[PDB]
């Protein structure tokens, strides 16, 4: 089947530059900022004209997007597109001046009975960079009720996230709850016991 693979996406400082490539087996580049819609970059767009330059090699089967003098707003997932359309899997480009940091995990202790089988508790995955982070509960045993929210980018440039779970209020005396936070970019694994306060 007609497929496309992308590479070259990584972490870059705001002033820096990066090049991402797409090999096939006309071409279009589009990006998607976190939680926003598809934005056409070039195939130039007004925010990227002048700084971005699309090149193409018909010999080595590749399409290049040369991103020079990046900005924070350039942080997105860039896609290849070229009747049967085919799209690459995407590679994320993150532009920030913050350095890689492991999250600080804080308990969201169960309180606020709101009772009748439902109690809420969770963990606060705070001040980490970059994305993504993985949160599981009781080493993967707890899967019903867990909501791991999409991260928000704080003003400091570090992300923050909350992962909550609803459990029978009868069980929080008996059952113990630990959340497993895994931040692969920083090679950090944290287990935090959440107990009532």
């Amino acid at each position: 089947e007609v497929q496309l693979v992308e590479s070259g996406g990584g972490l870059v400082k705001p002033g820096g530059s990066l090049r991402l490539s797409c090999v096939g087996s006309w071409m279009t580049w589009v990006r998607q900022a976190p939680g926003k819609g598809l934005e056409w970059v070039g195939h130039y767009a007004a925010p990227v004209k002048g700084r971005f330059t699309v090149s193409r090699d018909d010999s080595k089967r590749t399409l290049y997007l040369q991103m020079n003098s990046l900005k924070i707003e350039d942080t997105a997932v860039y896609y290849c597109m070229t009747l049967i359309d085919v799209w690459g899997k995407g590679t994320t480009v993150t532009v920030s001046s913050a350095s890689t940091k492991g999250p600080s995990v804080f308990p969201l202790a169960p309180s606020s009975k709101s009772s009748g089988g439902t109690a809420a508790l969770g963990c606060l995955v705070k001040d980490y960079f970059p994305e993504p982070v993985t949160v599981s509960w009781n080493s993967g045993a707890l899967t019903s009720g867990v909501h791991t929210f999409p991260a928000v980018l704080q003003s400091s440039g570090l992300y923050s996230l909350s992962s909550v779970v609803t459990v029978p209020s009868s069980s929080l005396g008996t059952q113990t709850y630990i959340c497993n936070v895994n931040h692969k970019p920083s090679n950090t694994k944290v287990d935090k016991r959440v107990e009532p306060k």
Binding site: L38, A45, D85, F106, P107, S111, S112, K126, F149, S162
Partner: protein, 212 residues
């Protein structure tokens, strides 16, 4: 040169309903230069129709393209559970921009949020920052409102995030976290979270006093 708008922002329908999405342009677009894309959460976009009305390969018959000039519509004749996604329209004549998107979610019985409030942990207070978290759990529709009261005081600096529509229950969950310094936090007593929602006849408030 040309801007695009889509209506509505979110579309709440049930499986077996007929969906009609709209793409409107600021200036006229030729009928060979308007396409429609579909994107499910966590996947790459997919071409549905191109040239206003022509379908792409392997696309079911429910998807119908229509429109001309400055108004275009995408029709999904009978919705299937896999058809609940985000749909973008794209022009490619003078301007090549995408539209804002239209979210199509499963219409579900109205569900009021389960509100929970979490005080800052003593471990966090050892760092010099206090972040109190309000949780709105398993509600529908997606539209909800959260307001913060550090004293019976209205705030202007907090952050929120909302989950995607759950694959099984078809509900949403929202978390609003208020970030204060430890100096600010220790000064005030009663911390309240006010929640407004279509499933609530009157606003729900959950609060705690710092001493507890």
């Amino acid at each position: 040169e040309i801007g695009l708008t889509q209506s509505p922002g979110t579309l709440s329908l049930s499986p077996g309903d007929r969906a009609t999405l709209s793409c409107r342009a600021t200036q006229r677009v030729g009928s060979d230069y308007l396409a429609w894309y579909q994107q499910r959460p966590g996947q790459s976009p997919r071409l549905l129709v191109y040239g206003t009305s022509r379908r792409a390969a392997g696309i079911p018959d429910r998807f119908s393209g229509s429109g001309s000039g400055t108004d275009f519509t995408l029709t999904i004749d009978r919705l299937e559970p896999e058809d609940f996604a985000v749909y973008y329209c794209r022009q490619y004549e003078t301007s090549f921009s995408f539209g804002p998107g239209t979210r199509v979610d499963l219409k579900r019985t109205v569900a009021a949020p389960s509100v929970f409030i979490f005080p800052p942990s003593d471990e966090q207070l050892k760092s010099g920052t206090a972040s109190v978290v309000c949780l709105l759990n398993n509600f529908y529709p997606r539209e909800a409102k959260v307001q913060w009261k550090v004293d019976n005081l209205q705030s202007g600096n907090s952050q929120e995030s909302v989950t995607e529509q759950d694959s099984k229950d078809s509900t949403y969950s929202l978390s609003s976290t208020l970030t204060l310094s430890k100096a600010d936090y220790e000064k005030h007593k009663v911390y309240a979270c006010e929640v407004t929602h279509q499933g609530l006849s009157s606003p729900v408030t959950k609060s705690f006093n710092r001493g507890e």
